[PDB]
């Protein structure tokens, strides 16, 4: 079994990467299920965003970390070798796990 | 100015079906807990039958049909100057104004049990003496010497 | 009952006493560290301590020994 930790800061970049890795898996003959989306993880703050005092100028900002696992249940090796050196949309990170 | 507003008439009490008891527990509501007030008012008759309270048909009506408020005091401007003028009490606070005059008189009294301070305040309204009944009389006696403006 | 069973100390001022007892009528021995402890064998000596803008003289007594030097000297103005 293998899982692939595909992570991004944008909700479309991870779908455009899913449309490359899951299509490569199906065209290489891998037996695969529908991949889980996972609960989104967030980072947020509200700060004084003016250059010098002006105390009314407090504003909110947020950023979101998206993760998918892909999850291969079958022990077949040749069907998934096409994923491990594959190029994906710029700004995503990949790590392989159990 | 503009408005013309929406208004609320509140839910009845879940034991007696009385909206007058509901407004009484809302004026008796402190710290937003609201269940606490149910355990203070109409939670005993044995404490009203300890003083002047005669039969259960008067165990709450002594704050309702026993009185009729009509006016409130303070000053009002007429032309270029201000005068002391009695103003006409509104017809739905008419039956719920004396609720504050009873709840305040019991709440600010130094005599321990609050459920008993309230039953004793209702007994002192059932005799028609002092608290709440003179707060009606004082402003009527004022308005019987102040009639030129409305 | 002081902070830890072992006291934090340096002997850098105690090492001057056997020479500060022969100064004559010269101006007293001068120090800047005020957290320093005063040992019983420092008694009967005049020392000059920082007040925050100058140095002022104090004499070591049976009330000053076993405590810190800064506890016996002024630290602020308007006096």
């Amino acid at each position: 079994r293998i899982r692939i930790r595909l992570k991004a800061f944008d909700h479309r970049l991870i779908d455009q990467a899913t449309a490359e890795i899951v299509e490569t898996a199906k065209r290489t003959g891998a037996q695969v299920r529908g991949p889980i989306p996972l609960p989104t993880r967030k980072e947020r703050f509200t700060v004084l965003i003016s250059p010098h005092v002006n105390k009314d100028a407090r504003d909110q900002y947020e950023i979101r970390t998206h993760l998918r696992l892909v999850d291969i249940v079958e022990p077949t090796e040749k069907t998934v070798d096409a994923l491990m050196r594959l190029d994906l949309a710029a700004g995503v990170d990949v790590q392989i796990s159990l | 100015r503009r408005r013309v507003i929406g208004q609320r008439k509140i839910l009845p009490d879940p034991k007696f079906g009385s909206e007058l008891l509901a407004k009484f527990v809302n004026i008796l509501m402190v710290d937003g807990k609201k269940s606490t007030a149910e355990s203070i008012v109409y939670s005993a008759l044995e404490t009203l039958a300890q003083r002047s309270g005669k039969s259960e048909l008067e165990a709450f009506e002594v704050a309702l049909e026993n009185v009729r408020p009509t006016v409130e005091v303070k000053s009002r401007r007429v032309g270029g100057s201000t005068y002391q003028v009695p103003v006409e009490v509104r017809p739905v606070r008419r039956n719920a104004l004396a609720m504050r005059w009873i709840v305040e008189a019991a709440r600010k009294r130094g005599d321990k049990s609050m459920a008993l301070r309230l039953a004793n305040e209702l007994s002192d309204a059932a005799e028609n003496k002092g608290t709440a009944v003179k707060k009606r009389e004082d402003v009527h006696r004022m308005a019987e010497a102040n009639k030129a403006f409305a | 009952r002081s902070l830890k069973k072992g006291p934090f100390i340096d002997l850098h001022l105690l090492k001057k006493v056997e020479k500060a007892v022969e100064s004559g009528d010269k101006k007293p021995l001068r120090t800047w560290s005020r957290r320093s402890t005063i040992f019983p064998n420092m008694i009967g000596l005049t020392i000059a301590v920082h007040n925050g803008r100058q140095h002022v003289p104090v004499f070591v007594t049976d009330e000053m020994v076993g405590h810190k030097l800064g506890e016996f000297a002024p630290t602020r103005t308007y006096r």
Partner: protein, 100 residues
């Protein structure tokens, strides 16, 4: 902010590298409520009372583009008067203004 405040802190972090780095739990072999009042671990204390220029204090994160100590946002290394510029100039991944 004088430029020495960061230029000295980088030298103190390089010095903590022999005294505190993977050694901040090393007190856990000399700390005891009593120890039968014996002494056998002073070989650690001789080196924990040695440094003076390195300590668990005297540090200020500042901004990696300004020596200013306050108004800083740790995970970016930037300030509350620099991230709104960077997020509109397109200089930082993951962060944007408005839409959303």
């Amino acid at each position: 902010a004088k430029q020495s405040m960061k230029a000295r802190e980088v030298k103190r972090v390089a010095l903590a590298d022999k005294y505190f780095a993977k050694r901040a739990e090393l007190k856990a072999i000399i700390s005891d409520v009593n120890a039968s009042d014996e002494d056998r671990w002073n070989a650690v204390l001789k080196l924990q009372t040695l440094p003076r220029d390195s300590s668990p204090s005297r540090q200020r994160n500042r901004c990696r583009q300004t020596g200013r100590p306050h108004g800083f946002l740790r995970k970016f290394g930037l300030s509350r008067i620099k991230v709104r510029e960077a997020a509109m100039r397109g200089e930082i991944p993951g962060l944007k203004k408005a839409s959303w």
